Design a protein around this ligand. Structure first.
Ligand SMILES: [Mg+2]
Ligand SMILES: [Mg+2]
Ligand SMILES: [Mg+2]
Ligand SMILES: [Mg+2]
Ligand SMILES: [Mg+2]
Ligand SMILES: [Mg+2]
Ligand SMILES: [Mg+2]
Ligand SMILES: [Mg+2]
Ligand SMILES: [Mg+2]
Ligand SMILES: [Mg+2]
Ligand SMILES: [Mg+2]
Ligand SMILES: [Mg+2]
Ligand SMILES: [Mg+2]
Ligand SMILES: [Mg+2]
Ligand SMILES: [Mg+2]
Ligand SMILES: [Mg+2]
Ligand SMILES: [Mg+2]
Ligand SMILES: [Mg+2]
Ligand SMILES: [Mg+2]
Ligand SMILES: [Mg+2]
Ligand SMILES: [Mg+2]
Ligand SMILES: [Mg+2]
Ligand SMILES: [Mg+2]
Ligand SMILES: [Mg+2]
Ligand SMILES: [Mg+2]
Ligand SMILES: [Mg+2]
Ligand SMILES: [Mg+2]
Ligand SMILES: [Mg+2]
Ligand SMILES: [Mg+2]
Ligand SMILES: [Mg+2]
Ligand SMILES: [Mg+2]
Ligand SMILES: [Mg+2]
Ligand SMILES: [Mg+2]
Ligand SMILES: [Mg+2]
Ligand SMILES: [Mg+2]
Lengths: 70, 155, 116
RNA sequence: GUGGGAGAGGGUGGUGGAAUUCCCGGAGUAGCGGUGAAAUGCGCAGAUACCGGGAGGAACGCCGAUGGCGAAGGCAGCCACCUGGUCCACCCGUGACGCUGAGGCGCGAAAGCGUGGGGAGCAAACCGGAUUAGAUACCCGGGUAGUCCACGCCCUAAACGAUGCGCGCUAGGUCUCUGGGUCUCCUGGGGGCCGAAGCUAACGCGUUAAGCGCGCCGCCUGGGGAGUACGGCCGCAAGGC
């Protein structure tokens, strides 16, 4: 399986407003993806988590979602 | 059978029909090791069942034993306290054994004085779809479809 | 007396019971059923067979209301949490989609001693 | 000193969503809940389930780790402000200004105390239901103090790495966090795991020493009696030293 960073450009990990790329790091649900599937380093993941939370509070990213086909 | 599969005994064929189920039934009629008297019982019953109804005793025997074979039963399984009655299907070999045992036990629970008469009338009733052996079989099957709420305890 | 023709079906399953509420596309319920609505009384209500029978009974009441297309919502976990959906699939109601919307907190409340 | 860096380090104020409870409304019947089974309990004054709205308190899912920070206790949503510690590179400045530390002083989980607030969920005591030979328990239903906040006390702990602080010396290998570098790698500084020499009664320790040394502090001297008695000091008390 592909990790998120492997298929992505040279993007800003500190931009909470770019929903297009931050959506890639959320799961099928609103959960933040683990480092196993994001292919990020510890520092990269630590920054991404805070930017994702920022985007969430601005109503740009979903706090939680609903699972399908279950 | 802790180690092996306990290979099934292959009974000898029959001297009259050449069929093995007849030998099995004759063994189920035998008591105290008298296979001669049991064979005479079964064959006088064969004559009686072929005369009182003008059909071949072969296919009537086969159809009766087929009618008595059940398709489901219950076994007790210990889960969370006292055990429960869990339904399940049956092996073909066990279906054979249970059918023959119910045949003999319902035949000897009959009123008829002579043994051969009991055997013949029991086989007739079982071949028609009624009688005591088929009643016990249908009670076994009625145990299924009843406690079917335990269908998740199959094991 | 409604003729709804389409709606949602919520399956709330626990380890003590399973209940199904069939509702309309804007949230109001139409019919419902559970392991106690049908004959079972005690722990028997938590078996998957009771869940199947509850789903089937609710689906037939929905037929009485005239339900054809159904969207499924699932909350909770228990025996027959899936059997309810299987019976609901084979009940005669065309299943639109299945969704698991089990409510999970973000660690706000303190559980009972049983759950820690 | 300069220039960079990581962080649930602390304080203050704000703020977000999920969930529980409660209230309003809609729609909707006959049970829900609970257990190994059950019953108390709740429900026809309409519950449970579903939908919409409102209120309030507490705690921060995924990220999250075998991770990070702190002297220890301990510290996880997000934002801003105030502030501590620490690491690295440059080789710039002072020029032994150091180490330890009886007493003192400050900090110190939880529970507990006082005054005043707050109160969803949980929940000692307590009220019931079961289970059992009995049930004063485990299991179920309720439920007060408390848990939360402000301020002032309390000074305990398996307060644990059961390993005081500092410095120097003594094979490496592997995983990792965070810096710098000419960036298969090297070089610092933290977190683990194997293992040289050596140590150990053994288990085990082994550049994060329980090894080889040095300085300073604390403590030990058979078990029970007993962390008891008396005395003193501290404390509102409980009680602590
Ligand atoms: Mg139940
Ligand atoms: Mg902090
Ligand atoms: Mg802070
Ligand atoms: Mg209402
Ligand atoms: Mg009532
Ligand atoms: Mg009542
Ligand atoms: Mg209130
Ligand atoms: Mg976790
Ligand atoms: Mg540290
Ligand atoms: Mg700082
Ligand atoms: Mg110089
Ligand atoms: Mg000089
Ligand atoms: Mg000092
Ligand atoms: Mg001192
Ligand atoms: Mg304290
Ligand atoms: Mg306290
Ligand atoms: Mg108080
Ligand atoms: Mg409670
Ligand atoms: Mg209780
Ligand atoms: Mg009692
Ligand atoms: Mg020493
Ligand atoms: Mg580098
Ligand atoms: Mg190191
Ligand atoms: Mg190492
Ligand atoms: Mg050695
Ligand atoms: Mg070792
Ligand atoms: Mg040392
Ligand atoms: Mg030693
Ligand atoms: Mg002492
Ligand atoms: Mg002594
Ligand atoms: Mg004491
Ligand atoms: Mg004295
Ligand atoms: Mg005293
Ligand atoms: Mg006094
Ligand atoms: Mg005491």
């Amino acid at each position: 399986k592909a990790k998120v960073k492997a298929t992505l450009g040279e993007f800003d990990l500190r931009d909470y407003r770019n929903v297009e790329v931050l959506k890639r790091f959320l799961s099928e649900t609103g959960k933040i993806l683990p480092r196993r599937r994001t292919g990020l380093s510890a520092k990269e993941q630590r920054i991404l988590a805070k930017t994702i939370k920022r985007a969430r509070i601005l109503g740009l990213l979903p706090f939680t979602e609903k699972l399908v086909r279950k | 059978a802790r180690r092996r599969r306990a290979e099934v005994r292959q009974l000898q064929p029959d001297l009259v029909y050449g069929d093995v189920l007849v030998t099995a039934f004759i063994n189920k009629i035998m008591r105290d090791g008298k296979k001669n008297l049991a064979a005479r019982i079964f064959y006088d019953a064969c004559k009686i069942i072929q005369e009182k109804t003008g059909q071949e005793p072969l296919k009537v025997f086969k159809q009766a034993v087929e009618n008595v074979k059940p398709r489901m039963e219950v076994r007790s399984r210990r889960v969370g306290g006292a055990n429960y009655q869990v339904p399940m299907e049956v092996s073909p070999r066990r279906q054979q054994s249970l059918a023959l045992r119910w045949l003999v036990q319902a035949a000897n629970q009959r009123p008829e004085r002579r043994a051969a008469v009991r055997i013949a009338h029991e086989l007739m009733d079982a071949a028609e779809g009624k009688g005591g052996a088929v009643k016990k079989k249908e009670d076994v099957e009625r145990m299924a479809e009843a406690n079917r709420a335990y269908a998740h305890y199959r094991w | 007396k409604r003729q709804v023709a389409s709606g949602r079906a919520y399956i709330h399953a626990s380890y003590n019971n399973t209940i199904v509420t069939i509702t309309d596309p804007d949230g109001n319920p139409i019919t419902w059923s559970s392991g106690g609505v049908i004959g079972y009384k005690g722990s028997r209500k938590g078996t998957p067979y009771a869940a199947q029978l509850a789903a089937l009974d609710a689906a037939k009441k929905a037929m009485a209301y005239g339900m054809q297309s159904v969207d499924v919502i699932v909350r909770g976990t228990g025996a027959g949490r899936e059997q309810a959906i299987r019976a609901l699939q084979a009940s005669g109601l065309q299943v639109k989609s299945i969704v698991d919307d089990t409510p999970v907190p973000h660690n706000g409340c303190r559980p009972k001693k049983k759950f820690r």
